[PDB]
């Protein structure tokens, strides 16, 4: 019961980390296109 | 102590596999001991991990011999044995998880579903269909094929031909493991052959030559010819001769359901054609089917969707269009929508691997 609280913190941190990776990849697809235009 | 309890469980499983037909003398004589090892909550006692060292196929073989009124020999006439077993398997499902432990989960739903198909109703079936759907990466190739085999049979009864057609084709793919080159393959094959006939027709038996015995092949040829010629008299006779097969499968209903397709197929073969169509020419064609009901059968045809045509019975001539020209009917649009699903769904699983 106490345990779950510990584990919920690890789960939450991880969840945000995953959503943040998704978002970063988006800026990169964008970056790619822009870089091809510049070259 | 711990190691000894895991060992204890391996020894009961092992014993239970041995005392069957597989690795020992005759399954029925042995059944009572096989049942003693299951029953007094030693199966329960196994919960160190999930059931996947004993499998649904195995629980199936012991329970069928116990009870089916043909191996039991009307030993008892009650499904008292199965009711306790189904309940206990149901009791397992509650504490089963779906996300990472669905090895035990699919197997239990397989055993329960099976019993409904053996003897039950097509009404209660709906809930079991919805519960079943769980990843197909967790269960063996052998176990996946059996899961599809039962699902496909259930879908046929509802008259979902298409869904069963996909599951069956996937079911019988490759053979890295047995019961996709054995007796199980032949059972699958018969059910696949039936599902294609239901859709319209099966006109290929190339694969089936090599994966089925001669006794099966003859009835497959007789059916496909009856349905292709359109001739009801040959079809009926095919059921009559291979009465023993249709009974065996436990599905004499198929005969009743398919026969309607044959008379529908006959009316179709000679299309709509010319802009006015003579009564006589069509009468001749309908006479084959049933000859004292020319006007009724043609009326039934139009409502049904066998044909679409426009009738005068104060002139007694038939008017038609003949369409062989395929303009757009949302047909690009449909392609696109399908493709976005096809690419994403495929794409994600391939990526995980």
């Amino acid at each position: 019961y106490f345990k779950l609280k510990k584990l919920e913190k690890e789960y939450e941190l991880l969840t945000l980390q995953e959503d943040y990776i998704k978002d970063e990849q988006r800026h990169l697809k964008r970056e790619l296109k822009r870089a091809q235009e510049e070259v | 102590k711990t190691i000894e309890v895991t060992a204890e469980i391996n020894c009961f499983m092992h014993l239970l596999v041995q005392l069957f037909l597989w690795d020992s003398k005759e399954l029925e004589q042995l059944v009572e001991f096989n049942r003693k090892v299951v029953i007094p909550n030693l199966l329960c006692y196994y919960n160190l991990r999930s059931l996947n060292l004993i499998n649904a196929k195995l629980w199936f073989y012991i329970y069928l011999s116990h009870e089916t009124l043909a191996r039991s020999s009307e030993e008892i006439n009650s499904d008292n044995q199965n009711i306790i077993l189904r309940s206990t398997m149901m009791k397992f499902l509650k504490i089963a998880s779906l996300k990472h432990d669905n090895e035990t989960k699919a197997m239990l739903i397989n055993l329960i579903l099976r019993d409904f198909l053996n003897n039950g109703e097509v009404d209660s079936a709906s809930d079991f269909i919805s519960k079943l759907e769980y990843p197909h990466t967790d269960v063996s190739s052998s176990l996946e094929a059996r899961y599809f085999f039962y699902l496909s049979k259930i879908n046929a009864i509802q008259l979902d031909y298409s869904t069963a057609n996909e599951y069956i084709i996937a079911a019988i793919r490759k053979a890295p493991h047995n019961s996709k080159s054995l007796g199980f393959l032949q059972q699958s094959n018969k059910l696949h052959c039936c599902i294609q006939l239901l859709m319209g027709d099966i006109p290929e038996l190339s694969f089936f030559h090599q994966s089925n015995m001669q006794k099966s092949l003859l009835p497959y040829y007789h059916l496909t010819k009856a349905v292709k010629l359109g001739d009801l008299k040959k079809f009926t006779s095919t059921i009559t001769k291979y009465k023993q097969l249709l009974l065996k499968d436990d599905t004499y209903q198929l005969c009743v359901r398919l026969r309607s397709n044959v008379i529908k197929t006959g009316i179709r073969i000679i299309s709509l054609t010319y802009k006015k169509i003579s009564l006589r020419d069509i009468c001749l064609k309908l006479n084959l089917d049933s000859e004292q009901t020319v006007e009724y059968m043609v009326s039934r045809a139009i409502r049904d969707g066998v044909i679409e045509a426009k009738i005068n019975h104060e002139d007694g001539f038939i008017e038609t269009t003949e369409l062989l020209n395929i303009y757009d009917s949302e047909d690009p649009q449909q392609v696109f929508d399908e493709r976005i699903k096809f690419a994403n769904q495929l794409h994600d699983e391939y990526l995980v691997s």
Binding site: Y1, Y11, E18 | -
Partner: protein, 129 residues
Amino acid sequence: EQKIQETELKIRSKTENVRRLEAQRNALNDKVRFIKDELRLLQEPGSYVGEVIKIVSDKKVLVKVQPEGKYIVDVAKDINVKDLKASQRVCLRSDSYMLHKVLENKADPLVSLMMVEKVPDSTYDMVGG
């Protein structure tokens, strides 16, 4: 008691999601970086080709460049003097005048109507007897 078990599943699930995304993330990330390096390279005046006339033992070399006149330039420290030799064709930076690689040696009678023909196809049976 049911509740603790459910939290343990959702973690296990999440990690696989991290593993998949991470692997793709890297592929894109590399591509931007690759393109940047390529862009630094695509800014250049080129390297001049020259012929090493002779090497001086004080770390000059005498080069006749084909682009220009004749020049004294500073031997590179990316190559050693025993790679260089008389009549070597080299690539030397127009930027830094450092001999960065060696091509091949050249000649002039070999293209003034004298020529090599390795392993000839004539036999004694050809004009036999």
